[PDB]
Amino acid sequence: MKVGQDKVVTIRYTLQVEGEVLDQGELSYLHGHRNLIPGLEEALEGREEGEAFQAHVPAEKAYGPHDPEGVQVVPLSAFPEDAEVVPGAQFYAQDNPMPLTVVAVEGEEVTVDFNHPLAGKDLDFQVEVVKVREATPEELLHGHAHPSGHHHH
Amino acid sequence: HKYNNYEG
Ligand SMILES: [Cl-]
């Protein structure tokens, strides 16, 4: 069975950005419902069970460009008392939660980034297509594949 | 737009 609209597809994958593994494992997803980044879904379209491939996905087809306006200076006083405010730390503002990543701390000022963590990055995937099956009515109703465990990290 | 506070 080939990957296509309304199939539930199981893949194993490795995600690298500039030669570094950021994510890997196994997942199932409902194809054709914007559940994966568009460039990855495009690369998966028409693939067969048992087929391995590589996909280079430019930022535009992944998490989008990095907007300089998303990088801002905010007060250290805005962060929780029991917070570790250090580069890499993630926090939220409420707009729906808006995630931010701390990128620098300088005295009472903190530079933060509201961009997606992979904005502006090109993504390199190794993919194995493991299984392709029809979606159930419940999966179509919910717009995503049924839980099958947390098997990527 | 500036926010009052952030949460973990
Ligand atoms: Cl899904």
Residue numbers in the entry:
A (entry chain A): 1 to 95, 99 to 156
B (entry chain B): 66 to 73
Paper text:
Peptidyl-prolyl isomerases (PPIases) catalyze cis/trans isomerization of peptidyl-prolyl bonds, which is often rate-limiting for protein folding. In order to improve our understanding of the mechanism of SlyD and of FKBPs in general, we set out to analyze the kinetics, energetics, and structural basis for substrate binding and inhibition of SlyD from Thermus thermophilus (TtSlyD) using 15-residue-long unmodified peptides, which we reasoned would be better mimics of natural unfolded protein substrates than the traditionally used 4-nitroanilide tetrapeptides.
For the T1 peptide, a single-site model was sufficient to describe binding to TtSlyDFL, and the affinity was found to be much lower (KD = 158 μM) than for the S2 and S3 peptides, which is explained primarily by an increase in unfavorable binding entropy. A peptide is bound to the IF domain in four structures: TtSlyDFL:S2, TtSlyDFL:S2-W23A, TtSlyDFL:S2-plus, and TtSlyDFL:T1. Interestingly, although the binding mode is variable, three aspects are shared for all structures: (i) the peptides bind to the β8–β9 hairpin through β-strand augmentation with two to four hydrogen bonds, (ii) the peptides generally insert two hydrophobic side chains into the binding groove as detailed above, and (iii) peptide binding does not perturb the hydrophobic groove. Interestingly, the proline residues of the peptides bound to the IF domains are all in the trans conformer—with the possible exception of the S2 peptide bound to molecule B in the TtSlyDFL:S2 structure, where P29S2 could be in cis configuration —and in most cases do not form direct interactions with the IF domain.
